[PDB]
Structures are given as C-alpha cells and as structure tokens.
C-alpha cells in the first residue's frame, strides 16, 4: 500500500484521490494520502476553494516511483514531483504516518468500483495520450484541448486521443461509401482495432481514460472522445461477443459512478438514444440500458 506525501497545504482546496474527495483548509496540517492500492493507476486532483475554475490533476502509478505533492506559490498550483532518494522518501512518509497527518485511501473491501473504471487503463498508454516524457506521471486539467479539437492550439499541452471521424477517408473505403457509413464494422475492426489500437484492451483503456478525464476535470474534449468510441462500437453490425459483453460492463460502472447532478453536461442525448434504441447493438447492452433507464430516464 503506497503513499503520496504532501510537503504542506498552503491554500484551501478540495483534493480528490480517484472517486473520493476531501476538503483541506488554508495551512491545515495535511501531509498526504496513504494506503493507496497497488495494481491500479490513480489520479490525484485539485479544485482551489478561491477559484473553482481549472480542476487539474495527476495520473500516476506508485509502482513507477516515489511521488509527492508540493504547492508552487509562483505557478499557483499543487505540483506532483518524483523523489529519487528512496531513504529520504521512506523517512518523510514514516514521520507523517507516525504523526497521523495523512488521510487513508478509503476503500471498502467489497468495492470493485475503481478496478471496474480502470480495468484496461495502463500508465504507459496515458503517457502517449499526455506527452511530457521527463515525468513518470501525467498532468490533465479542465481546459486542455484534444488533437481533434485543435484541427477544427499549443500542441505540447494537447490530449493526443486517437482521432475518430465518421465522415473521413479513414472511416470510408472508396466504393463502399453507403456500406461503411451505415455499418462502421470495417472502421472499428480493420482500421481501429487491427490497425491503430492492436487489440480491444488498448481501445477500452482509451475509452475508460477519456471518461475519467471528462468526469474528474469536466474536460469537454475527453467527453467527445468517450462518446465517439461508444458510438463507433454501437454503429458496427459485426463486433466480437466478448467486446460487447465487456463494453456493457464498462459503461454500467461509468453510468453508476457519474454524479446524478452532472448527467446534463456529461451525457450526449443523441449518442445514448442512438446507442440503446436504434443502433445494431441496441439489444447487446442490457446492464447499461437498465441502469440508464432507472437513473437518467429524462435524457432518454
């Protein structure tokens, strides 16, 4: 069970760790988060109490180094950093733990929510979408635009999600215009799965990462990417049975976790109505259709 110590908390802030969140007061003696489950990616996220604009945060995996948070009064944010001195780090964590200045990652033993939201998400895939190769962790915030959003403006600060565009030469084989537009199976199976992602695990990893950035930062471009990757599957007549069964589980846990009050800004009416009621896969997402009907019947 790993630890992310905090040097201090000089400004009042709401701190998230995965699906959990804690209010910290200005100069409150808060020195970090302990008992973080090994085996998953995690995200540690911030919303300042004095400017609730720019939610921002860091994707990390404690197996890939010793990470801590330190407030930078010049750039005005909580920064993740790596401590390369193992013994210094162990000595910092031991003191803070002894003085009980740390919150405990509050996982219920029965609760598989975080595994279910991150099953296919790998740090090495995050680092290719979010390019900053000198760090082993990845900064994301509310305002970062996607490569697709930038085509339609600082490329170093972009989310490099795989571009999906249903009216593009990539999506449509010359001479199969109607077939490929109405049945996206060749775009899903040949171009995206065999071609770009190499397997369904990588495709689901990107879908799950996009949802989490949409939910935790209200990143609009991430929300567009999440919907595009769902629509591409639901709009394909030919999808492996194991992918459909897995997609229903993935979406069920995403819909279960979404705050009820953000359904209006995080769910696209057209995509969900099309996916559950008109698409080729309208009958293949039983768990997702039941939770959507019971939790968000207004949207439908």
């Amino acid at each position: 069970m790993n630890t992310v110590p905090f040097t201090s908390a000089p400004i009042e802030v709401t701190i998230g760790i995965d699906q959990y969140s804690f209010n910290v007061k200005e100069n409150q003696p808060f020195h970090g988060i302990k008992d973080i489950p090994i085996g998953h990616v995690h995200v540690i996220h911030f919303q300042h109490a004095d400017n609730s604009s720019m939610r921002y945060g860091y994707w990390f995996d404690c197996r890939m180094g010793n990470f801590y948070i330190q407030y930078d009064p010049k750039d005005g944010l909580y920064k993740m950093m790596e401590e390369r001195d193992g013994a210094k780090f162990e000595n910092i964590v031991h003191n803070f733990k002894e003085r009980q200045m740390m919150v405990s990652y509050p996982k219920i033993d029965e609760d598989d929510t975080w595994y279910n939201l991150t099953e296919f998400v790998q740090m090495d895939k995050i680092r290719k979408i979010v390019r900053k190769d000198e760090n082993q962790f990845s900064y994301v915030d509310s305002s970062m635009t996607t490569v697709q959003e930038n085509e339609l403006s600082d490329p170093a600060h972009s989310l490099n999600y795989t571009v999906i565009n249903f009216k593009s030469r990539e999506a449509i084989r010359p001479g199969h215009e109607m077939e490929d537009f109405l049945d996206k199976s060749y775009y899903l199976n040949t171009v995206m799965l065999q071609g770009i992602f190499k397997n369904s695990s990588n495709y689901f990893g990107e879908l799950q990462f996009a949802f989490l950035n949409a939910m935790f930062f209200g990143n609009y471009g991430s929300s567009l990417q999440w919907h595009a990757m769902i629509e591409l599957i639901c709009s394909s007549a030919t999808v492996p049975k194991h992918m459909l069964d897995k997609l229903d589980e993935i979406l069920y846990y995403q819909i279960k976790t979404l705050p009820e009050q953000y359904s209006d800004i995080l769910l696209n009416e057209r995509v969900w109505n099309i996916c559950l009621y008109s698409s080729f896969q309208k009958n293949s997402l039983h768990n997702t259709e039941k939770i959507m009907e019971n939790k968000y019947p207004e949207l439908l």
Partner: protein
C-alpha cells in the same frame, strides 16, 4: 451554410454551382396483388442536376434495373444519387467542377458529403428555398427520354432554351421556377396555358415554346393566376 432568400443573388455569380434534386430518382406505382396485398412497381427515374447560371441540366436517367434485388430502396436512392453526382463531378474537367453543390432535400447532405470526401473544397449545402424541381417530369421531352430509357443514360439539356440571349440568369431562373411551380400545382391547366395557341411551337432543340418577350409576359401572368386560383382552392381563402 443554408441557401435562402437572403443570399439568392449568389446563384447567378461566376462561382460554378449545381442544384441536385433527388425527388424523381426512385418512382413507383402502388398496386393490389392477386392475394389482395399491396406491392410497388418501380418506373424509370432521374437525377435533376442543374447549373442555375447557365441552364445546363445533367439529367441522369435511373433505369429500374438499378433497384433489382436491393433492399430499403428509398435509402439506397439517396446513396445512388450521391454516387452519380460524384461520378459526374469526376467526369468534368477541373475548371468545370462546381465550387458548391446545393441539395434540395436535407436527407441528401450526408450521402453526398461522404461520396465527395475526395473533394474537400466543394461545399455541400442545403437550401431553405422550396424549389419545384419535382415537376421536371411534367416537361414532356424530359418525361419522354426517362420513360423510353432501356439502360442507364446521361442526357444533357439547356433548361432555359435560348432565353439567356434576351434575359439575365436571375430572370431565367425566376421564369423556370414559376413554370415548374404552376406545373406542380395544376399540371393540366399549366400545359393548357403553354400550348393553347397552336401558332407558337417548341423548336426540335428546345423544351418550351418559342414565345416573344410580350407573349412571355402574358404566359407568366397566366401562370401566377393559376397558382393563386389553385391556392384559393386548397385553403378556402
């Protein structure tokens, strides 16, 4: 974006553009079967592709063989229209290709956009105008070449005959839309107005009669009266 009353002069500028109307591509007669069920029989159709500046009409005849063994024909008819328009653009020399294609029905936008991906600089636009191009099959010579076709065929016409020798494109398009509107509202009365005087004939190389400027004013009046008389019937006003 959308072509409307506000940007109407744009039709007659020097940027090549085409209107595409798909309303006569998939045409059927509905009839009873021996068992008392209902079935359709397709008849020959056409794509109405018109340069509103020059009057050049690219009439692609759609022979009933193109539907044989196909499902969801009303959906296929939009894709076949977009395929044939795309093939027409590719067949034209670069300096003759349109800069814009305006579809008369919004259901043509995606099919045509997808078929024209190779031409990203050709704007595919809808229109708010209610154009009467469905009445193209009330022009006897167009109807005749469609019904006689035994195979797919492209036939080229000038829908304005020689009018541009005497009037502007704007005025010619206004005359054409008023003639088609009349033919659409009351075909029998419109055709009666056009042929009532046997001394005025249709040249072999023309679609419409050889009216003098003064006779065109009388005809245009008679067409406006027909449209109002018919409107006084539909609506009880």
């Amino acid at each position: 974006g959308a072509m409307n009353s506000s940007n109407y002069a744009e039709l007659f500028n020097n940027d090549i553009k085409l209107f595409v109307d798909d309303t006569n591509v998939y045409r059927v007669t509905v009839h009873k079967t021996f068992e008392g069920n209902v079935a359709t029989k397709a008849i020959n159709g056409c794509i109405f592709t018109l340069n509103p500046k020059t009057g050049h009409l690219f009439l692609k005849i759609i022979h009933t063989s193109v539907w044989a063994g196909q499902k969801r024909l009303s959906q296929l008819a939009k894709w076949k229209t977009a395929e044939e328009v795309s093939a027409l653009v590719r067949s034209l020399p670069k300096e003759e290709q349109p800069k814009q294609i305006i579809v008369t029905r919004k259901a043509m936008l995606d099919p045509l956009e997808v078929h024209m991906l190779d031409f990203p600089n050709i704007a595919i636009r809808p229109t708010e105008l209610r154009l009467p191009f469905s009445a193209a099959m009330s022009i006897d010579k167009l109807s005749d070449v469609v019904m006689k076709a035994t195979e797919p065929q492209m036939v080229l016409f000038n829908i304005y005959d020689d009018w541009l020798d005497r009037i502007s494109s704007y005025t010619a398009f206004s005359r054409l839309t008023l003639l088609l509107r009349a033919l659409k509202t009351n075909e029998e009365s419109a055709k009666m107005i056009l042929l009532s005087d046997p001394t005025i004939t249709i040249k072999s190389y023309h679609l419409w009669p050889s009216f003098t400027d003064e006779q065109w004013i009388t005809i245009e009046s008679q067409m406006r009266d027909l449209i109002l008389t018919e409107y006084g019937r539909k609506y009880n006003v």
